[PDB]
Amino acid sequence: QWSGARALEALLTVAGELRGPPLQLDTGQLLKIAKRGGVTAVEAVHAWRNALTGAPLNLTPEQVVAIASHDGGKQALETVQRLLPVLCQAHGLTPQQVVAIASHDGGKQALETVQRLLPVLCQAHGLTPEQVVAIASHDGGKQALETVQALLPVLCQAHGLTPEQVVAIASNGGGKQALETVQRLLPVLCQAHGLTPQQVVAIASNGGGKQALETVQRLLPVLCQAHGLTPQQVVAIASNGGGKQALETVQRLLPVLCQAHGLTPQQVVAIASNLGGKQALETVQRLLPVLCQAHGLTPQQVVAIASNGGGKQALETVQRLLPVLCQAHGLTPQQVVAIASHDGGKQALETVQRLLPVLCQAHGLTPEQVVAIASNGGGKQALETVQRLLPVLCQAHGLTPEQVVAIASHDGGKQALETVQRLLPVLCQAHGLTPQQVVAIASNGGGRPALESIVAQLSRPDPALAALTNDHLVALACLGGRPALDAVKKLEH
DNA sequence: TGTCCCTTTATCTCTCT
DNA sequence: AGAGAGATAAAGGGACA
């Protein structure tokens, strides 16, 4: 008999128990833990179900699943119940910060290293606790924290980096590797190739940073003489996760895409210059003639879809869904292109296929409004949030559907909608803002933090902003969101 | 196997003007 | 509004005890 059977049966038995109180986990949550944390993590959750949920830690089940669902999940669960009170009371961290550090492979190691190194990194190295938390909150967080402790001085003194830069480099998975590589390669890339430290940090500050830097050192000469790429173009391609893969693929496919399809080098660089750039390039090479065939999509439009993170997914999804979206739901191909041309274009396309009939018939939106909401990053999330919150926002809060659509139709739309639903009553009732003013603040990228900043200034007034009326604060918040409010505080004092 | 660390890709949100 | 950046997450491989 297959050996995994006994372990599988154990998994399934324990999993069934966890559907009961006090966690009541669903099928998804259960598979998620089993998939990454394994059967030991599933058993640890059950074993420590009571100690985690209520007094003293009071963790949500979502927080328990998030800690459990990684390699060493069992170890992280034990460690959190032990160290969460310590880190909150002895270092002044929030439970949310402790859970964030815990929620990665080897979270035990990160937690214990934070407990050990936070004081010396803050006192002897000048870091804030937030920076230590951010360094800790990735796979290998322990290695990154120890490497920041060791290398912060030589990186700032011998190599000219700021602590912000070092923290930025450290704050990715593999952070130790990127730090050690930047130490070695910063003089090489700057002096031999005329890169600024700022360009080097940008290349370093992603997962696999070590790989991208070494690949830039290796390929920059070939790319910038043979192919005729500029150093700036190479830096842009390198400055994303999978940067090594994107750079090697540009070397491969730049002449192929230009000659076989008449794409420009600038168009190829743009496609390469996203997360998954390698996948996007290879997919364009395969699919462009399939998409463009017989006055179909233009190359221009194919390039546009491809020129976002996960562009491969958007391209394949357009190939799948262009006909049904146009036949059944009556969209123009220009509209499908618009929806596809953002990060997560695949998710947005599939969500439009799924929710266009419902938002139209059940909620009285136009296809144009559904398209407008879908046509931003996180379009799927905004569409699902509009479906969920249109009734309470309209019926209980007095907003028109037009206003809801406007709030929804920006990056972060979901966050803006949920924040309006939350804070509209206190902003209007308690502080006298009009609904239209609240809608205006929320109808921008960064809607959520702009609303939260306003709420904070109205609830716990900072004298630095006191000279501004509510109307002036609204104007500032619409103009530049949270950053503008913060920028204004700094100007005052 | 269980755990830790590293890399790549995809998705979501916010900033910067 | 459209170009950068972090943020979060899934998932695979190397390593080793």
Author numbering: 231 to 723
List sentences quoted exactly from the publication behind this structure.
Transcription activator-like (TAL) effectors specifically bind to double stranded (ds) DNA through a central domain of tandem repeats. Each TAL effector (TALE) repeat comprises 33–35 amino acids and recognizes one specific DNA base through a highly variable residue at a fixed position in the repeat. The crystal structures of TAL effector (TALE) proteins bound to their respective target DNAs have revealed that the residue at position 13 is the only one directly involved in DNA base recognition, whereas the 12th residue stabilizes the proper loop conformation. dHax3, an engineered TALE protein, proved to be a useful scaffold for structural characterizations. We then present fifteen crystal structures of engineered dHax3 variants in complex with target DNA molecules, which elucidate the structural basis for the recognition of bases adenine (A) and guanine (G) by reported or uncharacterized TALE codes.
The structural observation suggests that Ile34 may not be a major contributor to the affinity of DNA binding by TALE repeats, consistent with the classification of NI as a “weak” TALE code. It also insinuates that base A may “tolerate” a wide range of amino acids at position 34 of a TALE repeat when there is no steric clash. To test this speculation, we generated dHax3 variants with the 34th residue on repeat 7 substituted with different amino acids. In total, we obtained nine high-quality structures that elucidate the accommodation of base A by Leu, Met, Cys, Pro, Trp, His, Thr, Asn, and Glu at the 34th position. Among these, the hydrophobic residues Leu, Met, Cys, and Pro all adopt conformations that do not clash with base A. As what happens to Ile34, there is no specific coordination found between these hydrophobic residues and base A. Trp, Thr, and His, in spite of the presence of polar groups, do not form H-bond with base A. They also appear to adopt conformations that simply avoid steric clash. These residues may all represent weak code, if they are used for base recognition.
